């Protein structure tokens, strides 16, 4: 997260760390949506042009974390994976269209103060909240700046980071980039004119873009951090998987394979 700040503890209890076993590293962000299911971006798990195709045994999910590197004995829970489910129309060849994946945990995690799932939007909520100008929140342990810019050492954060960003009109998203933008993506971030800053960056991808409903006080995950052209550049915006468009796929998978 660029230009974000330290999360308060328990501020984002659906935040999940996708952790590579060997070599040990933060792969991606992710979100807890029930006791047995975690949601993330497909490009975190599958991108053949960089020979990327992670199996279930290659990874661990770590939930309830605040610290990036420490084992937090009294807070975090580590789970193994049973099955990865990638969107079958995930278009890595061109523009990361339908960049969405589900992960079934081998055993159900118990919820706690630090571990609690986010809601998925319905049609009403999506119609209400996904509007240009309205802000959502993005969190993660990705980089604090683009790599090989500014000062190297202070690149990875100590603790989970949070930033709030406004949804941007579709025409500006489209006019901001050469990539083919589809209705399974939306974009967010401040405009050069608006004199505030912030963005997802490398390592935050796959994590949630959340909005709080004023109708019922609940946090809904409206997006998954998908792609960008660098991090936090003027005239550029982060692009997010439109979670509601693909909600039917999420429920189809969970109803079939959720025991």
């Amino acid at each position: 997260i660029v230009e974000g700040s330290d999360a308060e503890i328990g501020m984002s209890p659906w935040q999940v760390m996708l952790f590579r076993k060997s070599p040990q590293e933060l792969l991606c962000g992710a979100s807890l949506i029930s006791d047995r299911w975690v949601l993330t971006a497909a490009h975190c798990l599958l991108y053949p042009p960089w020979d990327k195709n992670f199996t279930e045994n290659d990874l661990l999910v770590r939930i309830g974390k605040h610290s990036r590197t420490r084992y937090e004995r009294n807070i975090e829970k580590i789970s193994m994976l049973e099955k990865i489910y990638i969107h079958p129309r995930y278009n890595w060849r061109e523009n990361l269209d339908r960049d969405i994946a589900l992960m079934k945990l081998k055993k159900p995690v118990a919820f706690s103060d630090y571990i609690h799932p986010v809601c998925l939007p319905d049609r009403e909520t999506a119609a209400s909240l996904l509007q240009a100008g309205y802000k959502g929140r993005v969190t993660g342990w990705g980089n604090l700046k683009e790599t090989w810019t500014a000062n190297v050492g202070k690149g990875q954060p100590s603790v989970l980071q949070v930033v709030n960003l406004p949804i941007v009109e579709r025409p500006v998203c489209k006019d901001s980039t050469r990539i083919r933008i589809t209705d399974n993506m939306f974009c967010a971030g401040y405009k050069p004119d608006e004199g505030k800053r912030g963005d997802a960056c490398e390592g935050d991808s796959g994590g949630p873009f959340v909005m709080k409903s004023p109708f019922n006080n609940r946090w809904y995950q409206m997006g998954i951090v998908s792609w960008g052209e660098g991090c936090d550049r003027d005239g550029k915006y982060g692009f997010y998987t439109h979670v509601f468009r693909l909600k039917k796929w999420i429920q189809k998978v969970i109803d079939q394979f959720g025991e």
Binding site: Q24, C44, T69, R73, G142, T147, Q156, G203
Partner: peptide, 17 residues
């Protein structure tokens, strides 16, 4: 996925508590 220093992460045991 492009984010780490060397010997960075504390080791993770096999705990269920």
């Amino acid at each position: 996925h492009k984010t780490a220093p060397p010997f960075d992460f504390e080791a993770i045991p096999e705990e269920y508590l």
